[PDB]
Amino acid sequence: EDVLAKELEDVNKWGLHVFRIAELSGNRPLTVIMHTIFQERDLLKTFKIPVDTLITYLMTLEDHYHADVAYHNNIHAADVVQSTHVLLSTPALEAVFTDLEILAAIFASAIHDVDHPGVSNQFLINTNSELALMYNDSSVLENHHLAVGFKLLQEENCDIFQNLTKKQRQSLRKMVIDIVLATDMSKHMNLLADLKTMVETKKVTVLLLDNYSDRIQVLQNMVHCADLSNPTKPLQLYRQWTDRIMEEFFRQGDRERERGMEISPMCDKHNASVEKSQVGFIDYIVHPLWETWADLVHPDAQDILDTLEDNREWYQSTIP
Amino acid sequence: EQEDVLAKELEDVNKWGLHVFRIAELSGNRPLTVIMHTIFQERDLLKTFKIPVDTLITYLMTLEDHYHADVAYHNNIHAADVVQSTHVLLSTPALEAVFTDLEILAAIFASAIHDVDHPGVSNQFLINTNSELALMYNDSSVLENHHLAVGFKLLQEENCDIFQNLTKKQRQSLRKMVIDIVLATDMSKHMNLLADLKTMVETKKVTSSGVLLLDNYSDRIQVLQNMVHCADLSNPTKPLQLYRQWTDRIMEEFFRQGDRERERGMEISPMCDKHNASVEKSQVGFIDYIVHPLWETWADLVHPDAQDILDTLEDNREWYQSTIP
Ligand SMILES: CCOc1cc2c(cc1OC)CN(C=O)CC2
Ligand SMILES: CCOc1cc2c(cc1OC)CN(C=O)CC2
Ligand SMILES: [Mg+2]
Ligand SMILES: [Mg+2]
Numbered sequence: 078e079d080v081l082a083k084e085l086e087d088v089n090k091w092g093l094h095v096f097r098i099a100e101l102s103g104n105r106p107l108t109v110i111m112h113t114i115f116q117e118r119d120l121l122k123t124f125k126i127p128v129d130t131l132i133t134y135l136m137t138l139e140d141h142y143h144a145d146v147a148y149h150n151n152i153h154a155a156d157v158v159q160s161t162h163v164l165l166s167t168p169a170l171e172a173v174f175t176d177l178e179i180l181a182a183i184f185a186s187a188i189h190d191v192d193h194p195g196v197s198n199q200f201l202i203n204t205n206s207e208l209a210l211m212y213n214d215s216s217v218l219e220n221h222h223l224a225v226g227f228k229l230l231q232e233e234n235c236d237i238f239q240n241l242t243k244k245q246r247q248s249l250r251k252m253v254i255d256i257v258l259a260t261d262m263s264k265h266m267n268l269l270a271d272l273k274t275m276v277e278t279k280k281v282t283v284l285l286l287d288n289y290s291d292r293i294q295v296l297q298n299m300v301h302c303a304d305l306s307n308p309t310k311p312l313q314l315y316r317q318w319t320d321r322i323m324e325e326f327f328r329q330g331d332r333e334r335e336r337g338m339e340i341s342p343m344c345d346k347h348n349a350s351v352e353k354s355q356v357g358f359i360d361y362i363v364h365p366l367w368e369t370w371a372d373l374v375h376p377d378a379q380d381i382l383d384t385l386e387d388n389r390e391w392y393q394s395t396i397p
Numbered sequence: 398e399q400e401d402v403l404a405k406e407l408e409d410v411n412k413w414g415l416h417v418f419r420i421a422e423l424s425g426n427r428p429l430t431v432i433m434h435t436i437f438q439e440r441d442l443l444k445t446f447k448i449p450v451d452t453l454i455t456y457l458m459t460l461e462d463h464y465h466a467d468v469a470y471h472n473n474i475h476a477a478d479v480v481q482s483t484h485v486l487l488s489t490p491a492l493e494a495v496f497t498d499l500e501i502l503a504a505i506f507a508s509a510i511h512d513v514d515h516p517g518v519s520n521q522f523l524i525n526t527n528s529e530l531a532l533m534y535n536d537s538s539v540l541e542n543h544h545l546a547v548g549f550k551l552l553q554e555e556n557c558d559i560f561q562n563l564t565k566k567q568r569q570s571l572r573k574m575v576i577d578i579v580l581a582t583d584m585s586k587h588m589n590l591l592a593d594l595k596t597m598v599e600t601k602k603v604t605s606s607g608v609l610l611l612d613n614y615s616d617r618i619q620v621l622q623n624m625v626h627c628a629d630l631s632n633p634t635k636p637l638q639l640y641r642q643w644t645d646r647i648m649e650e651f652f653r654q655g656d657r658e659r660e661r662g663m664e665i666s667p668m669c670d671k672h673n674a675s676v677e678k679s680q681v682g683f684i685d686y687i688v689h690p691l692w693e694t695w696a697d698l699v700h701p702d703a704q705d706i707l708d709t710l711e712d713n714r715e716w717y718q719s720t721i722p
């Protein structure tokens with residue numbers, strides 16, 4: 078347990094040993110990392126959150142991530158939380174966001190994939206699932222993650238927001254919904270176009286963002302960057318994330334094949350190129366997003382962008 | 398004899414001003430079932446889509462049951478009225494041969510389901526009271542998402558799949574169109590929907606035949622969304638004896654919501670305080686700021702097809718205004 082404490086000293090660093098933390102904590106990385114971050118940011122004292130209520134909520138939330146899903150599980154949630162925590166400290170975003178906006182971004186990251194079944198929105202729609210029927214085919218998973226994350230606050234001794242005012246709770250809820258809905262990959266291109274527009278109109282002394290529309294767009298892109306941060310991490314971490322997403326994708330492909338469905342891109346284990354897929358995803362999605370983020374916060378994201386470019390070069394070199 | 402009178406009244410299904418409340422009584426509180434059945438026969442939809450008649454009746458009766466008989470306005474009579482009003486608007490000369498049979502089916506089905514399982518309180522009430530519905534739907538078009546989910550889920554009940562003989566591509570296209578239409582009935586979308594309809598009117602293209610030219614999905618679905626929204630907001634355009642009954646019903650529903658807000662220590666929603674209400678000023682305001690701007694624009698889109706409807710709306714506005722001084 079002293080090993081676990083030593084690993085958590087890196088909580089402010091990109092490249093935290095999140096898999097080691099998952100093992101050392103008895104598969105409770107979300108709980109221990111969220112607790113650590115709330116302490117580092119003084120969020121329990123600021124929002125009068127009882128520590129026992131926080132721990133109880135976090136353990137319940139963590140229990141609703143599926144242990145048999147290779148990628149979209151509590152380790153991914155913990156990684157997105159910790160990554161958002163680092164991005165919130167970008168010098169170019171210094172004191173841009175209120176304590177309530179910080180709480181919203183962190184809470185949104187923690188719940189943003191809760192109860193994920195390990196299959197995509199398109200799979201849920203095409204199989205006429207109960208989830209797609211409930212949500213009218215529109216951000217099916219993301220609406221469900223939000224609903225579960227909020228519903229769990231109603232469990233016994235789980236209301237971590239009990240001492241927020243009515244106004245603060247309504248504002249936080251709206252921001253969390255706006256952030257988690259923006260994690261739907263079908264919204265990526267629109268989010269990126271809006272981030273590009275903001276970079277072009279960037280006002281700086283350090284970023285100056287006067288209206289809520291611009292600030293929520295930054296928080297949306299921030300959590301989206303954290304969600305898409307695997308290729309920007311040290312290679313030993315990134316390769317583990319690649320193994321996990323490919324296992325989850327191949328299992329979806331096995332279900333599609335057993336049902337006689339058309340197999341989704343990257344999901345056909347008999348016809349996959351793991352490495353070409355990573356290079357393509359960096360080239361078309363991850364690098365355009367992170368290059369734009371780096372422009373917004375220049376030069377604070379340079380080391381992250383450097384790692385992403387090194388990792389892209391390495392994956393390309395594994396292709397004969 | 399009661400069935401004879403019902404059949405006579407259903408002969409008016411192509412007319413604005415159908416005696417929908419009489420039909421509700423004569424049909425044994427099955428206005429949505431009998432009006433939908435009549436419209437499907439009138440448009441030959443059972444034959445076109447190979448819909449078994451017993452499946453249609455079974456679905457319609459189950460759908461109608463899922464409207465709340467104890468809600469004064471948002472009940473099966475309102476659904477039947479919106480269905481029949483959409484059916485009349487679809488027949489307007491400016492739209493002849495514009496929409497496919499599948500698009501017609503989508504608009505009519507959307508109208509039938511568009512308020513199903515409505516609890517008689519607003520989205521804002523459901524959000525402010527931390528309701529299970531608002532928790533499920535993340536405060537976003539709460540009611541309208543629920544109406545769609547119920548209307549589609551009921552197709553899965555025994556002998557209820559009225560779309561069983563559509564192709565897969567037809568079912569997929571119909572589902573998307575119905576979702577787009579019902580979500581556009583959320584009043585929080587009204588201003589943007591109207592702004593877009595005005596832009597279409599200002600740029601509208603007509604064919605050699607004189608009908609509206611709609612050559613992409615975005616324009617086609619926008620017309621159908623505004624058509625069903627106009628039907629949903631059509632009460633002040635109806636003959637006055639129908640309009641006044643609708644006003645009595647919405648006020649009962651509003652006042653019951655306001656009583657719940659007052660008991661909870663909440664600010665009472667506009668028009669919901671029975672101790673500080675002006676029913677007549679509220680109707681004039683409704684017309685001037687919502688219903689007439691919308692219907693004047695729809696009338697411009699289909700000009701001059703909707704002139705008599707617009708004239709009735711203006712006469713009814715004058716009537717309510719005259720009761721104020
Ligand atoms: C190393 C991780 O690689 C990936 C992660 C994810 C995707 C694609 C990836 O690579 C092709 C697509 N997603 C959902 O569909 C989000 C997660
Ligand atoms: C004669 C009917 O009058 C009305 C009907 C409705 C509203 C307002 C009305 O008048 C002020 C507002 N709505 C929902 O909140 C839709 C239904
Ligand atoms: Mg997700
Ligand atoms: Mg009922």
Ligand SMILES: [Mg+2]
Nearest residue numbers: 511512540582
């Ligand atoms: Mg409605």
Ligand SMILES: [Zn+2]
Nearest residue numbers: 153189190304
């Ligand atoms: Zn995620």
Ligand SMILES: [Zn+2]
Nearest residue numbers: 475511512629
């Ligand atoms: Zn309605």
